[PDB]
Amino acid sequence: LVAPQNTFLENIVRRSNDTNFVLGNAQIVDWPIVYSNDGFCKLSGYHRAEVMQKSSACSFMYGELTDKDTVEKVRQTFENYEMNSFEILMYKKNRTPVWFFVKIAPIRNEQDKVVLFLCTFSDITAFKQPIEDDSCKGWGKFARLTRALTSSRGVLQQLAPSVQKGENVHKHSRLAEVLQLGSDILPQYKQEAPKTPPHIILHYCVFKTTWDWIILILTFYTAILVPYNVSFKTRQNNVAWLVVDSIVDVIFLVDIVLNFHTTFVGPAGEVISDPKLIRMNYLKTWFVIDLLSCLPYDVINAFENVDEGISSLFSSLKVVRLLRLGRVARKLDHYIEYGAAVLVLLVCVFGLAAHWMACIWYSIGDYEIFDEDTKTIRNNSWLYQLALDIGTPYQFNKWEGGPSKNSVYISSLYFTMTSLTSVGFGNIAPSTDIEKIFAVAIMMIGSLLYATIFGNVTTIFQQMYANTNRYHEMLNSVRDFLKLYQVPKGLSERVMDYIVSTWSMSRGIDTEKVLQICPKDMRADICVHLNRKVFKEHPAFRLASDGCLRALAMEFQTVHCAPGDLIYHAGESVDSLCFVVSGSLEVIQDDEVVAILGKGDVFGDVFWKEATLAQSCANVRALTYCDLHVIKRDALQKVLEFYTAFSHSFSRNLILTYNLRKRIVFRKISDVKREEEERMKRLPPDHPVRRLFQRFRQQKE
Amino acid sequence: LVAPQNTFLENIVRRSNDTNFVLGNAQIVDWPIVYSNDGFCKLSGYHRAEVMQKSSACSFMYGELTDKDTVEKVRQTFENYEMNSFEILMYKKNRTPVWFFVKIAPIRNEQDKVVLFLCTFSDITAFKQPIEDDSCKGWGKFARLTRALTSSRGVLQQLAPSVQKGENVHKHSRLAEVLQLGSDILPQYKQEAPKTPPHIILHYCVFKTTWDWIILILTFYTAILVPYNVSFKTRQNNVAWLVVDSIVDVIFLVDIVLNFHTTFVGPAGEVISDPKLIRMNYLKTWFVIDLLSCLPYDVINAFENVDEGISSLFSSLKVVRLLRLGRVARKLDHYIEYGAAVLVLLVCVFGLAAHWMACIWYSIGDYEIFDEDTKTIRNNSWLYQLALDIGTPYQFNKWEGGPSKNSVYISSLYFTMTSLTSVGFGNIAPSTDIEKIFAVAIMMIGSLLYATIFGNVTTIFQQMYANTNRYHEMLNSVRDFLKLYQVPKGLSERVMDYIVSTWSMSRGIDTEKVLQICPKDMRADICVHLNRKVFKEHPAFRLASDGCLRALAMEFQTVHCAPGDLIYHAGESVDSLCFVVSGSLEVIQDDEVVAILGKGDVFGDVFWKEATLAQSCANVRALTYCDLHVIKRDALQKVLEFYTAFSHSFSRNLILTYNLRKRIVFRKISDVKREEEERMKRLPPDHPVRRLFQRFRQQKE
């Protein structure tokens, strides 16, 4: 998790080393200043706000002793863009002249251009010719001039008083710090990315992902095989297994070597890629135990071995991965995503634990069967009972071999496996004291791991089935509510269809919440993207600035209307302009169609001109599955009055397709036909209602 | 999930094929235009807004060369409602005459009426007699006229330049596209439902619901029976089972045939019913595996079979349903709703798995008992131990049969069943190597399924008992709160009764939340339905328009008042009109009853006339369980001032039963009686208080 980062200011202030600097623009005439520094504003007495937007030729602290030659030199250096360093008499706020040195260094840009200048400053008043304009005394002016040379008199040239004729090196020492500014110019005012150092590879790379699986399977294989080899007294009649062990060991050696040149996630940070400390962290974390883990004791044992038991500790030596990789195998928890991979992990660890405890059961039995010099058969031991039951019992002339190692291994495996899973068949029995205590330990640990499996699997089931129950409960509650208040079917069907459709489409996601999660800039950009159709298609928005576009986009709300639903009823107040982006809409008046609406059409009223609310004169009904983009009247009015220049064109360019306030008058064909029929088949004393009609007409006039 | 859908615009624009059209009303005199098209407004230069509400006789682009004969023809065609097609000189915005062709086609309606007209347009300027009014040159006018014939010169008549005398087919080609408009007239401007194609039946039908259960039970029976038949070496002494197998197979064949003519839910949509692709989807999804599953290998085997093991794979062949139906058996999760049906599913799969593993245990034992040519009895095998224990041991003269198949089956079943449920009795033992590994696998898978059962059952218990605990905890918290603040019993009893009653009635449903879930139109309709009593009974609302009715209904709130509770206390501000719909209320003043209120009565104050707030002069108390419909003063005032016409009758018709602001004065019987008694038993120096009384009377005057 890293971002392209601009490290201009930080590098320049770190490299300054108690100096000063002033920044200026490069593609701009006369070069106004873009930045100043505390050291400068303290030495020159000019505040930062009053130096801003000043010529970078430094004309504003010129004076009588300034040389026009130096002015031409700084001008040709600025216009030719070259490194250089001058000394020239400058003037402070009190117009007192003080000896001065300067050096300029423009900086390039990632786009192959020069954008910013950089001019550094220094005082050499105490080491130059003494010049005074108006002072109480010569020594007083000298002390005043020397008092401003603290930076030069500091550790930069602290050895000057102890020596003589040090001027031959003071200038070089002063210029050495300034000359380093090229290193700070490397970013070139650009989003310099944190490039990886050479011969170090990211740990998220494809090669490392495919290397992690192979090291996992190899460590799994070794963890299985080693105890069987070490305890079951197997011989080395097969040489190929030594070749396999050698290639296995060299693979682990390659892995431990590769772990040097690989970045790791810092626990106190995010990503650390500094080779001066990556290797140190690895060696202080896991490298020594991994080395003492990764020595071929058995391969050396092919010639000679210092100890026989070293190959036994070689097991737990290889097991250090099981934690080094196993806890990092939470990165293996990346995609096996159908149920938690912790389940595969627990079943695998159950298997390997069963193998381990089968091995140690065999070890116990072999340690128990014989009585050494006592020559006692010790018949109550489990292995002798198994030998009697399996057939081919022991005999003596020396003693017979009895059972073969293959059957003994699997029988011990069953004992362990029936012990761990707590079925306890009862054919092969612990019968002596140490088998007794072993059964104790095995049954304890098996019960614990059994409980762990159950807890994990139950958590999975409850997490998978959580959402379905809540949705069904909400639906049932809605159904009960509609049943209670005697709602007719014609409306209950509509409400349940709406609920089921909106749940199927939107799922368990809130658009408003997702919007409010993001910050203001991302929110505005998302709004622009969501509403981009209406801006880019409707000609009324082709003169929109970014600010007005964003202020409008923040407000627009989208509406999905099903077929048959109505938007604006007759008699309702109209207060929202709305653009049609999909489907088609119709307007019905007095049970007659007067207009039909399609894509890229808007209908409403001129709020900014009428400046008053009005009654809707007709109903608008949905035909097809349509999408609407609605704007409220108050917010639109506020935005348009804020953006007067935009409104002067918005009012002229925006034309409504149909005005809800305005309504048409008309007649019907059947009505005029029946009127004609009635007139073919064709009040004198109606004086009061005649006067009524006259009064009504006069009032209407 | 489908809806009645109007597909007028979409069909007409899809069928247009790069043409133009204009819509007009049919039951309306002179036929104003209801719709225009981009092609028309580009060719005729008239904007859409300025052509709307214009005569469909097209009089507004008439001119000097227009023929009155054609006017009469278009008029008689409009008034007789017949298909026809004319050519006539039209006029554009620049009044330049351009040769023109027209064709009209009115559209009917689902209610057996003609509602809309449809007139199409085309240009034939380049293929008619050249007529000019004012042009720079003849060839210039010819080029101008031909430049407007891009649509005709396109792919519609692209072969014209390559041939000669093509006029005999150009008119037919032009008219062919226009003549297709009858197909787009099929919806007839109506909510055309998506009717199912013939010989295809919906998958939600009753027949298919009753067919799913039978195929489920048949596949369950076959899955049980097949392994027992294939492994236990049973003979064919019973012929009826072959008849049953034949009828079973023909039922599966009928099912696979029926699956062709049946709609399915589209994963990328909702419902797909296109027979051109339903069969293709089925064949590419499951049809081939179902066919190779549904061949009567055993019925053919009655004569001859190419392989004996085919009947074994016939098992897993039939098992494909167990997934094809079993995952679709989430539709079986429709109503067994007392606990999840997943429990019945898991117990059934446990049973079938136990059967399978009993079968394979028998197979292993039979494979193990005998040593073939070695003639070894192999006594350590489980089956021989069982034979010795059960009685009738083996004997030789050939070898005896020993145990019967019935006991062997059930014994293997017990072994599997004790293995899966992890009780492990210990009478019948795995003793050789392969029984060993089989025990390994069986105990693993049994532990997994055991954990699954436990997780599911625990989820059920927590989901059933969730709500009771939260309700009890809330009640206990309320009880602790009331105990803390020393509330007397007379009030604690009331608050706890109110809480328990409102929880018992409303349950865990929020009326406000349910309202806000629905959109604005459904919300308004619900409000109208909930408050319909007061509108339809009270005469004051019998002059209410739909808009005012809805604007009022949005605001009304219902109140359930228990007996004994008070609504408006003396001294409280009155700010809400309220209608009584059930029960009865009384008003008490100075501990005397002045009025009683019943059904269909309203009480409050005239807010629209007083235009000021007032103090309540009396208390109103509940008598019976009553329901109130309350309206706030501000919203009512806003609505009535919005709807002036409604208010002019609402003020005149609405009369209060009792005015809270107005209060009556009176005397008491006991008071006047005691005054009469006192007067029967009957101040001169009280000058200051006499002056006080005089001043008070003068102030009151």
Residue among A406, A417, A623 whose CB faces B443 most closely:
A417
Min Cα distance B571 → chain A (Å) is 36
Residue among A563, A615, A667 whose CB faces B4 most closely:
A563
β-bridge partners, B658: B603
Whether B529 sits inside 8 A of A469 (CB atoms) is no
Question: Which chain A residues have a beta carbon less than 8 Å from that of B451?
Answer: 453-454, 457-458
Min Cα distance A633 → chain B (Å) is 17
Phi-psi region of A71 (alpha: psi -120 to 50; beta: other; left: phi over 0): alpha
Q: Which residue of B lies nearest to A622 if distances are taken between CA atoms?
A: B6
Question: How would DSSP label each residue in B410-466?
Answer: HHHHHHHHHHHTT----SS---SHHHHHHHHHHHHHHHHHHHHHHHHHHHHHHHHHH
Give the best residue of B2, B27, B558 to mutate against chain A (max A CB count within 10 A): B27
Min Cα distance A614 → chain B (Å) is 9
Whether B431 sits inside 8 A of A390 (CB atoms) is yes
- Residue whose entry in the numeric block shows the structure tokens 């009369």: B655
Whether B546 sits inside 8 A of A564 (CB atoms) is no
Whether A563 sits inside 8 A of B6 (CB atoms) is yes
Lookup: tokens for B527:
């409000």
The β-bridge relationship of strands B114-123 and B100-104 is antiparallel
Lookup: tokens for B658:
């009792």
Whether B526 sits inside 8 A of A487 (CB atoms) is yes
Whether A668 sits inside 8 A of B29 (CB atoms) is yes
Q: How far apart are CA A43 and CA B1, in angstroms?
A: 80
Q: How far apart are CA A403 and CA A408, in angstroms?
A: 7
Whether A477 sits inside 8 A of B530 (CB atoms) is no
Q: Which residue of B lies nearest to A344 if distances are taken between CA atoms?
A: B448
Q: Which residue of A lies nearest to B462 if distances are taken between CA atoms?
A: A462
Q: Which residue of A lies nearest to B431 if distances are taken between CA atoms?
A: A390
β-bridge partners, B101: B87, B122
Q: How far apart are CA A565 and CA A494, in angstroms?
A: 10
C-alpha to C-alpha distances, A601 to A104, A271, A559, A564, B582, nearest whole angstrom: 61, 53, 15, 19, 50
The β-bridge relationship of strands A658-659 and A601-604 is parallel
Lookup: tokens for A285:
């974390």
CA-closest candidate to residue B24, choices A580, A601, A669: A669
C-alpha to C-alpha distances, B657 to B513, B536, B601, nearest whole angstrom: 35, 18, 6
Whether A498 sits inside 8 A of B508 (CB atoms) is no
Q: Which residue of B lies nearest to A625 if distances are taken between CA atoms?
A: B5
Question: Which chain A residues have a beta carbon less than 8 Å from that of B444?
Answer: 347
Q: How far apart are CA B685 and CA B695, in angstroms?
A: 17
Residue among B52, B426, B522 whose CB faces A595 most closely:
B52
Cα-only R_g, chain A? 46
Whether B526 sits inside 8 A of A414 (CB atoms) is no
Other Cβ atoms less than 10 A from the Cβ of B31: the count is 20
Question: Which chain A residues have a beta carbon less than 8 Å from that of B509?
Answer: 477, 480-481
Q: Which residue of B lies nearest to A487 if distances are taken between CA atoms?
A: B529
Where do the H-state alpha helices sit in B232-296? 240-258, 275-282, 288-293
DSSP-derived secondary structure letter, A540: G
CA triplet B540, B542, B545: central angle to 5 degrees?
110
Find how far residue A146's CA is from the centre of its chain.
Answer: 56
Give the best residue of A346, A425, A510, A619 to mutate against chain B (max B CB count within 10 A): A425
By the 10 Å C-beta count (0-12 exposed, 13-18 middle, 19+ buried), A593 is classed as buried
CA-closest candidate to residue A33, choices A57, A5, A3: A57
CA triplet B525, B528, B530: central angle to 5 degrees?
110
Other Cβ atoms less than 10 A from the Cβ of A482: the count is 19
CA triplet B222, B225, B230: central angle to 5 degrees?
115
Helix (H) or strand (E) holding A581: strand A576-582
Cβ proximity of B118 and B106 under 8 Å: yes
Q: How far apart are CA B521 and CA B554, in angstroms?
A: 11
Whether A570 sits inside 8 A of B191 (CB atoms) is no
CA-closest candidate to residue A409, choices A348, A354, A346: A354
Lookup: tokens for A612:
């008053």
The residues, ordered by sequence, that sit 6+ positions from B532 with a Cβ below 8 Å of its Cβ are: none
Question: How would DSSP label each residue in A341-381?
Answer: THHHHHHHHHHHHHHHHHHHHHHHHHHHH--GGG----TTS
Whether B458 sits inside 8 A of A458 (CB atoms) is yes
Q: What are phi and psi of B84, to 5 degrees?
A: -170, 170
Residue among B433, B518, B550 whose CB faces A498 most closely:
B518
Where do the H-state alpha helices sit in A485-531? 489-506, 511-517, 520-530
Q: What are phi and psi of A88, to 5 degrees?
A: -165, 145
CATH of the domain at B639: 2.60.120.10
Lookup: tokens for B197:
């194609």
β-bridge partners, B588: B593, B619
Q: How far apart are CA A318 and CA B337, in angstroms?
A: 53
CB contacts < 8 A (A, B): 187
Q: Rounded to a whole number, what is the distance in angstroms from the first to the last CA of chain B?
A: 77
Min Cα distance A367 → chain B (Å) is 24
Lookup: tokens for B556:
């009304």
CA triplet B213, B217, B219: central angle to 5 degrees?
115
Whether B455 sits inside 8 A of A462 (CB atoms) is yes
Whether B440 sits inside 8 A of A413 (CB atoms) is yes
Whether B521 sits inside 8 A of A422 (CB atoms) is no
CA-closest candidate to residue A158, choices A173, A178, A144: A173
Cβ proximity of A407 and B433 under 8 Å: yes
Q: How far apart are CA A670 and CA B128, in angstroms?
A: 41
Other Cβ atoms less than 10 A from the Cβ of A701: the count is 5
Query: What resolution in angstroms, rounded to 1 decimal?
Result: 5.4
Question: Which chain A residues have a beta carbon less than 8 Å from that of B554?
Answer: none
Cβ proximity of B15 and B180 under 8 Å: yes
Question: Which chain A residues have a beta carbon less than 8 Å from that of B447?
Answer: 421, 450, 453
Phi-psi region of B572 (alpha: psi -120 to 50; beta: other; left: phi over 0): beta
Lookup: tokens for B642:
């919005």
C-alpha to C-alpha distances, B309 to A165, B23, B247, B297, B305, nearest whole angstrom: 110, 72, 22, 10, 10
Whether A624 sits inside 8 A of B34 (CB atoms) is no
Residue among A465, A480, A501 whose CB faces B509 most closely:
A480
Q: How far apart are CA A304 and CA A307, in angstroms?
A: 9
Q: How far apart are CA B357 and CA B360, in angstroms?
A: 5
Whether A564 sits inside 8 A of B3 (CB atoms) is yes
Find how far residue B567's CA is from the centre of its chain.
Answer: 41
CA-closest candidate to residue B77, choices B35, B108, B100, B105: B105
Lookup: tokens for A152:
């030069």
Whether B424 sits inside 8 A of A418 (CB atoms) is yes
Lookup: tokens for A271:
């990503």
Q: How far apart are CA B166 and CA B159, in angstroms?
A: 9
Whether B547 sits inside 8 A of A570 (CB atoms) is yes
CA triplet B158, B160, B161: central angle to 5 degrees?
95
C-alpha to C-alpha distances, B31 to A593, B25, B52, B71, B164, nearest whole angstrom: 12, 6, 11, 14, 42
The β-bridge relationship of strands B658-659 and B601-604 is parallel
Whether A668 sits inside 8 A of B517 (CB atoms) is no
Min Cα distance A494 → chain B (Å) is 8
Q: How far apart are CA B23 and CA B120, in angstroms?
A: 9
Min Cα distance B526 → chain A (Å) is 8
Domain that holds residue B518: 511-659
Q: Which residue of B lies nearest to A566 if distances are taken between CA atoms?
A: B521
How many residues can be counted in chain B?
701
C-alpha to C-alpha distances, A264 to A209, A212, A274, nearest whole angstrom: 14, 14, 10
Provide the strand spans (E) within A38-79. Answer: none
Whether B52 sits inside 8 A of A458 (CB atoms) is no
Q: How far apart are CA A677 and CA A629, in angstroms?
A: 49
Min Cα distance B315 → chain A (Å) is 28
The β-bridge relationship of strands A90-91 and B614-615 is unpaired
C-alpha to C-alpha distances, B385 to A424, B366, B442, B536, B663, nearest whole angstrom: 20, 13, 21, 89, 106
CA-closest candidate to residue A418, choices B89, B393, B291, B425: B425
Residue among B379, B511, B548 whose CB faces A571 most closely:
B548
Q: How far apart are CA B432 and CA A440, in angstroms?
A: 27
The residues, ordered by sequence, that sit 6+ positions from B339 with a Cβ below 8 Å of its Cβ are: B460
Give the best residue of B2, B343, B440 to mutate against chain A (max A CB count within 10 A): B440
β-bridge partners, A614: A574
Whether A425 sits inside 8 A of B424 (CB atoms) is yes
Whether A453 sits inside 8 A of B451 (CB atoms) is yes
Query: Per 3-state DSSP, what percentage of chain B is helix, strand, and coil (rounded to 5)?
Result: 55, 15, 35
Q: Which residue of A lies nearest to B531 if distances are taken between CA atoms?
A: A485
The residues, ordered by sequence, that sit 6+ positions from B286 with a Cβ below 8 Å of its Cβ are: B320, B324
Question: Which chain A residues have a beta carbon less than 8 Å from that of B448?
Answer: 347
The residues, ordered by sequence, that sit 6+ positions from A209 with a Cβ below 8 Å of its Cβ are: none
Whether B433 sits inside 8 A of A566 (CB atoms) is no
CA torsion sign, A482 to A486 to A488 to A491?
Answer: negative
DSSP-derived secondary structure letter, A285: I
Give the best residue of A461, A499, A599, A615 to mutate against chain B (max B CB count within 10 A): A461
Secondary structure, 3-state, A439-475: HHHHHHHHHHHHHHHHHHHHHHHHHHHHHHHHHHHHH
CA triplet B134, B138, B142: central angle to 5 degrees?
100
Min Cα distance A546 → chain B (Å) is 30
Q: How far apart are CA B614 and CA B357, in angstroms?
A: 87
